[PDB]
UniProtKB/Swiss-Prot annotation:
Interacts with the C-terminus of trp, and with norpA and inaC to form the inaD signaling complex. Interacts with Fkbp59, which together with trpl, rhodopsin and calmodulin may also be part of the inaD complex. It is found in: Cell projection, Rhabdomere. It comes from Drosophila melanogaster. Expressed in photoreceptor cells (R cells) of the compound eyes and ocelli. Involved in the negative feedback regulation of the light-activated signaling cascade in photoreceptors through a calcium-mediated process. Interacts with tetrapeptide ligand located in C-terminal sequence of 3 key components of the visual cascade, tethering them and forming a macromolecular signaling phototransduction complex. Second PDZ domain is a type I PDZ domain that tethers type I PDZ ligand inaC by interaction with its C-terminus. The modification Phosphoserine is found at S19, S21. Phosphorylated by inaC. The lineage of its organism: Eukaryota, Metazoa, Ecdysozoa, Arthropoda, Hexapoda. Residues 5-85 form the PDZ domain. It comes from the Eukaryota. The chain holds residues 580 to 664 of 674 of the full protein. This is Inactivation-no-after-potential D protein.
């Protein structure tokens, strides 16, 4: 169980490219578009669990809310991630 951080500057017109799936402790990255952001291509992989987005703990929040927060991303983006086994 590795716990790390991802910080990036989102650019207008370029989506983070992450597809999400509900998880007990946050949002699982079910899929991602390689090449969107180097910070993502470098630190994230499918299966990674985002436990916090821009300082807000995602555990327990409805998946739909987590999705909305993700989609609302603008400017500086910060994520706390957990990578199983």
């Amino acid at each position: 169980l590795e716990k790390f951080n991802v910080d990036l500057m989102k650019k207008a017109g370029k989506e983070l490219g992450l597809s999400l799936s509900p998880n007990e402790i946050g949002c699982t990255i079910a899929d991602l578009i390689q090449g969107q952001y180097p910070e993502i291509d470098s630190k994230l992989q499918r299966g990674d669990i985002i436990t916090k987005f821009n300082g807000d703990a995602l555990e327990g929040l409805p998946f739909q809310v987590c999705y909305a927060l993700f989609k609302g991303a603008n400017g500086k983006v910060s994520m706390e991630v957990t990578r199983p086994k």
